[PDB]
Amino acid sequence: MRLDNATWGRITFGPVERVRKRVLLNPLTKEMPPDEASNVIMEILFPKEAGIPRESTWIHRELIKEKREKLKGTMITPIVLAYMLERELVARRRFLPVAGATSAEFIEMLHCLQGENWRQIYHPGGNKLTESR
Amino acid sequence: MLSNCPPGGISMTVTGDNTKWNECLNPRIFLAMTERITRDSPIWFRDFCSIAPVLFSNKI
Amino acid sequence: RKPVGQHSMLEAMAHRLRMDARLDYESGRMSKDDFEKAMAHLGEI
Amino acid sequence: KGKQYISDVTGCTMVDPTNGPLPEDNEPSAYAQLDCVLEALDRMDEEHPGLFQAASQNAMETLMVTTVDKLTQGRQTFDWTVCRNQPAATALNTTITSFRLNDLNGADKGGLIPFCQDIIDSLDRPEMTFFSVKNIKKKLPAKNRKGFLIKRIPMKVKDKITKVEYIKRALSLNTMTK
Amino acid sequence: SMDTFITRNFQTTIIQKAKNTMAEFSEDPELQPAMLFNICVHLEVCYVISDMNFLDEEGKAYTAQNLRPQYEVIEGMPRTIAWMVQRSLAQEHGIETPKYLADLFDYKTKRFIEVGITKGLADDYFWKKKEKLGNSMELMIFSYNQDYSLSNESSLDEEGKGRVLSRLTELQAELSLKNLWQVLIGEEDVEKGIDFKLGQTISRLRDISVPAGFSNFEGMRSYIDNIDPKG
RNA sequence: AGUAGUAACAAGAG
RNA sequence: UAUACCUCUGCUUCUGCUAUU
RNA sequence: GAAUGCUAUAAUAG
User: Fold this and answer.
1) Is E222 helix (H, G, I), strand (E, B) or coil?
2) Residues E68 and E54 sit within 8 Å (Cβ to Cβ)
3) Which residues, 6+ apart, have CB-to-CB distance to E230 below 8 Å?
């Protein structure tokens, strides 16, 4: 959807100094530590085998409730549902050569954003965070 | 390391490589390395780390 | 997620199934005739 | 050119180059001097203050948490019970099953430390016993002319090895080509 | 001693269940047996409440072939099994799971029960454990000086209330009889240091894994720690 | 034969 | 011995450690 | 005007 509802500017030829920085690869719905995320995932899919209730359960109470209602009607294997939620809760943060675009929704399109000797203007779709603005 | 070179001097770079690396490096030295590094660790942990080098020093 | 426990695998499996059955009975998922067999079979462990 | 001696554990021909005579040529030398290493380590420790203990701490705290299943992620490992390479996950299993026969249940506790305790303890066992499978013929009824069928069923048999034979296997390294 | 005491009084079922519960927290049953007794009593007191308590198909309590009790024992069962049971019940009936692990659960009342054995006063110890819970579990505290302090809604029958007080001051007398009551009076506290001792074989291997000019490993250890090899 | 190259395959097994 | 002009097999004829994660 | 640090079956590197 972000690619589809996008707008491409102009390509420009000229030197680009790329800097290698640790950036987020994929936009998350809500960012948590692995452990916090894991427990939130447990509450959604496997309530009985959750273990000790952590305070984290209460913090993401609406997320769990929301997700559990959305994934309620399904016949897909729970292990697949687990890793899908993990994909959009656990952060994939890795080193990449960037040049004036750190936002995940930009990073995901990093291959089309620039090279060493050229730069392409690209506007993602949907929404953009006010903090990132 | 480039910029911190003395002015009016020469900075040189030895593109290096160590031959017979695994063949020469001795376990008994690696045992010493653990003993030195685990100086202020409890006695059990000093002994724990010491095993792996010891096993390699008697390897078949 | 990796299950944790130094106890027996059978022990774990027994209790969970015992619970599941008890709740399945009282809830009304499981029948009396089935619950008879449930506790009987679990008794053999 | 180092100290050659016979191991009173395995009976093997051990050679020790360390603290040996310094080389007279540019041919590869293993004759590293302990003092020179320790000095180099000291210099490192000076210029990186309190890193050794900092690392030793974290490493030690890591060990405590580390489970045994950590060993079930390393390609083909040498299995001493069958004297051939096996998958890491099976190599561990075979060792755990064999350890139980010699009254070594450290693996059951879950952590790596008590399992490791069992490994160095297993060297003190006078004889080490382990399962090794043998096949057995058995008549089984069938819609056959003669009315039966022979099938080979495997059964675990307890094999023993001596204190030394086990040690050597523990210290053994399987070789291949890259 | 305490070691041989527990063999006479308690059954081997109660012994091993407590030892496992105590082992989970990584504390030696033999080196700290005062703490073992606490859990043993905690377990035996709990098991007496759910010994003969049953439920019929209509849904009423009675005293006992047949298999469906009125109570559900949680203390004694390994952590993950105990928690599974606690979560399973809460979800089915439709109530919030307590943050701390419960001891018992009544199928008729449909509420969690917290048990606590105390040395001194029973009534004061009720208010100590009212801070954490509040209104999560229906507390049921007991002490050794023949004193009871239950919640307002007490399901425990007067006949069953006696059996607790019997064993409370049956074994208490047995502790004083053999002069072993004074063992639990003292403050037992010691940290369980993770020791890793080397055997005979591996030690010998380490002694022969030494650089030249060293008798044994002890020599190498001290040399590295002590002497300064500058220059 | 050939592939190939410090040692193999050019079928192996019941 | 024989079944066998049959049947089974095609990384298992020893494939390590570590980093990019 | 910063972060959030981890763990694959490929490939490359040592």
Assistant:
1) helix
2) yes
3) D39, D42
Nearest nt (C1') from D73 Cα = H8
How distant, in Å, are the alpha carbons of A16, A79, A97 from that of A21? 15, 33, 6
- Note whether A49 contacts E91, CB cutoff 8 Å: no
Contact assessment for residue A124 and residue A2, using Cβ atoms and an 8 Å cutoff: yes
Q: Long-range CB contacts (< 8 A, 24+ apart) of D6-14?
A: D7/B58, D7/E208, D8/E204, D8/E208, D9/B58, D9/D164, D9/D167, D9/E201, D9/E204, D9/E205, D9/E208, D10/B58, D10/B60, D10/D164, D10/D167, D10/D168, D10/D171, D11/D164, D12/B58, D12/B60, D14/B58, D14/E208
Distances (CA, A) of E136 to D10, E83, E127: 64, 16, 14
Buried b / exposed e over E156-191, threshold 16 CB at 10 Å, is beeeeeebbeeebeebeeebeeeeeeebbeeeeeee
- Angle, to 10 degrees, between the axis of helix C9-27 and the axis of helix C32-43? 160
Alpha-carbon span A133 to A119, nearest angstrom: 21
Ligand-binding site membership of E153 (annotated): no
The integer distance in angstroms from the CA atom of A28 to the C1' atom of G21 is 19
Burial class (CB in 10 A: 0-12, 13-18, 19+), E105: buried
Chains E and B touch (3+ CB pairs under 8 A): yes
Q: What is the DSSP letter of D120?
A: H
- Nucleic strand G under 7 Å from the C-beta of D82: no
Residue E127, CB-side half-sphere exposure with 13 Å CA sphere: 3
Query: For residue E81, what are its two tokens?
Result: 């099994």
Distance CA D118, CA D99 (A): 8
What was the resolution (in A) of this experimentally determined structure? Answer: 2.9
Best to test chain E binding among C1, C11, C15, C23 (most E CBs inside 10 Å): C15
Chain E contact for B38, CB < 8 A?
A: no
CA distances from E132 to D16, E98, E151 (A): 64, 10, 15
Domain boundaries, chain E: 1-192
Contact criterion met (CB below 8 Å) for D130 and D111:
no
Strand G and D174 CB separated by under 7 Å: yes
Residue D104: phi, psi to the nearest 5?
-135, 95
Cross-strand bridge partners of residue D54: none
| A53: its two tokens | 């209730």
Residue with tokens 């960037």: A98
Contact D92, D115 (CB under 8 A): no
Rounded to the nearest 10 degrees, the angle between the axes of helix E217-226 and helix E200-207 is 60
**Which strand G nucleotides have any atom less than 7 A from protein CB atoms?**
14-18, 20-21
Please report how the helices D112-122 and D52-65 are oriented relative to each other, as an axis angle in degrees rounded to 10: 90
In terms of Cβ atoms closer than 10 Å to its own Cβ (0-12, 13-18, 19+), residue D141 is exposed
**CB < 8 Å to D64, chain E:** 194
> Which residues does strand H reach (CB under 7 angstroms)?
A 21-22, 31, 33-34, 91, 93; D 73
Distance (Å, whole) CA A71 – CA D14: 65
